[PDB]
Amino acid sequence: SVKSEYAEAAAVGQEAVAVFNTMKAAFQNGDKEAVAQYLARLASLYTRAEELLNRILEKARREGNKEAVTLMNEFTATFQTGKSIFNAMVAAFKNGDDDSFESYLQALEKVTAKGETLADQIAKAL
């Protein structure tokens, strides 16, 4: 079902949350060796989630589920905000800019925590 696919994409999302929190602890400890690996893992997770969310949106459209389309449009636009912030973090790590890294990390956390309200309504609309 579109709903089973949504639950799968939500689980990938929660996987990225878990890796993000481990990455934050490593950043705070100064384990540059670990942060680089977590960043690569997160990028692969975000790429997968984006693909899954897009397939779900296109299926909702083909089903004529207007309400799910609206919510998925709003959700994917916010997903892109987080992805822009994540890309900025990746660049800041590569430049050695821990100050910017922390700032972007904090921003990505609240773009993520504020997207929580919408993920719940998407499940119910699909």
The residue extents of the domains of the chain are 1-126
Q: Determine if residue 76 is left, alpha or beta; phi over 0 gives left, psi from -120 to 50 gives alpha, anything else beta.
A: alpha
Asked if 12 contacts 52 with a C-beta cutoff of 8 angstroms, the reply is: yes
Resolution in A: 1.6
Q: How far apart are CA 5 and CA 114, in angstroms?
A: 22
Strands (E), 76-126: none
Asked how this structure was determined, the answer is: X-ray
Q: How far apart are CA 40 and CA 43, in angstroms?
A: 5
